[PDB]
């Protein structure tokens, strides 16, 4: 059973880190310096550090050498106990379903609970069900 | 290979059988690399938008499915190494699940995430 290691990353560059290291692996899997990593876990709920799979601590140090996005947490690689390999993959309730209840971030109806009606397949806009709170142009000038 | 890696981070989805995470261009130009004889999502967009949905989370860099704990836990040990997901929500309609059973493919719910 392979071991799991934790490395520090830049905040806001998790998916970039993953897509960069995967391309590094595919770019060095046929050379004389391959990568001994199995997989790298990048949960969406976390922000700041990622996870990597390797049998020993030297493999991660020999694999993440040369990348500028993992240069900060390069001097230390912590190890989690064996019972934390399962709590990483757990996701609590993506998040796109019709006839659901969502809230707004910007606009006038901030922090107001709303409802979803229809979803545009273009992934550009989403229909929302709310109640107007305007004065109907009687108080404002 | 270079074809299973998403080129751009925008407009990427995940399948509901093997949880293949790729960009919308690769699902149309090439399709599902882990299942092409039962799904046939190469050459059109309606089938790509029907089975494969954007509602998914979690990314893993699957590289050695024959020897890895995460691969066995997600039952992706018999698939091709590449970008995969750990929780792909949704369900297939009753228009493509009936033929998979007659063809010998057991459609399993890849949503390992818990509800409340
Ligand atoms: Zn699949």
Curated annotation (Swiss-Prot), chain A:
PTM description: Methylated by PRMT1/HRMT1L2 and PRMT5/SKB1. Methylation negatively regulates interaction with P-TEFb and RNA polymerase II. Phosphorylated by CDK7 and CDK9. Phosphorylation by P-TEFb (CDK9) at Thr residues of the C-terminal repeats alleviates transcriptional pausing and promotes transcription elongation. Dephosphorylated by the INTAC complex when transcripts are unfavorably configured for transcriptional elongation, leading to premature transcription termination: dephosphorylation is mediated by the PPP2CA component of the INTAC complex. Dephosphorylated by the PNUTS-PP1 complex in termination zones downstream of poly(A) sites, thereby promoting deceleration of RNA polymerase II transcription.
Annotated source species: Homo sapiens
UniProt effect for mutating residue 72 to A: Reduces the affinity for Pol II elongation complex
Domain annotation KOW: ranges: 96-129
Localization: Nucleus
Role of this protein: Component of the DRB sensitivity-inducing factor complex (DSIF complex), which regulates mRNA processing and transcription elongation by RNA polymerase II. DSIF positively regulates mRNA capping by stimulating the mRNA guanylyltransferase activity of RNGTT/CAP1A. DSIF also acts cooperatively with the negative elongation factor complex (NELF complex) to enhance transcriptional pausing at sites proximal to the promoter. Transcriptional pausing may facilitate the assembly of an elongation competent RNA polymerase II complex.
Name of the encoding gene: SUPT5H
This protein's name: Transcription elongation factor SPT5
Homology family: Belongs to the SPT5 family.
UniProt tissue specificity: Ubiquitously expressed.
TM helices/strands, residue ranges: none
Curated annotation (Swiss-Prot), chain B:
GO MF term (any one): RNA polymerase II complex binding
SUPFAM superfamilies reported for this sequence: RNA polymerase subunits
Localisation: Nucleus
Keywords: Acetylation, Activator, Metal-binding, Nucleus, Repressor, Transcription, Transcription regulation, Ubl conjugation, Zinc, Zinc-finger
Family matches, as Gene3D superfamilies: 3.30.40.210
GO CC terms in record: DSIF complex
InterPro entries named in the record: RPABC4/Spt4, Spt4, Spt4/RpoE2_Znf, Spt4_sf
Keyword Iron among UniProt keywords: no
Biological process according to GO: negative regulation of transcription by RNA polymerase II; negative regulation of transcription elongation by RNA polymerase II; positive regulation of DNA-templated transcription, elongation; positive regulation of transcription by RNA polymerase II; transcription elongation-coupled chromatin remodeling
Main localisation: nucleus
Protein modification: Ubiquitinated by UBR5 when not assembled in the DSIF complex, leading to its degradation: UBR5 recognizes and binds a degron that is not accessible when SUPT4H1 is part of the DSIF complex.
Zinc finger residue ranges, C4-type: 15-35
UniProt-annotated stretches for the region Interaction with SUPT5H: 1-39
Family, per entry: Belongs to the SPT4 family.
Function: Component of the DRB sensitivity-inducing factor complex (DSIF complex), which regulates mRNA processing and transcription elongation by RNA polymerase II. DSIF positively regulates mRNA capping by stimulating the mRNA guanylyltransferase activity of RNGTT/CAP1A. DSIF also acts cooperatively with the negative elongation factor complex (NELF complex) to enhance transcriptional pausing at sites proximal to the promoter. Transcriptional pausing may facilitate the assembly of an elongation competent RNA polymerase II complex.
Subunit structure: Interacts with SUPT5H to form DSIF. DSIF interacts with the positive transcription elongation factor b complex (P-TEFb complex), which is composed of CDK9 and cyclin-T (CCNT1 or CCNT2). DSIF interacts with RNA polymerase II, and this interaction is reduced by phosphorylation of the C-terminal domain (CTD) of POLR2A by P-TEFb. DSIF also interacts with the NELF complex, which is composed of NELFA, NELFB, NELFD and NELFE, and this interaction occurs following prior binding of DSIF to RNA polymerase II.
The name this protein goes by in its record: Transcription elongation factor SPT4
High-level lineage: Eukaryota, Metazoa, Chordata, Craniata, Vertebrata
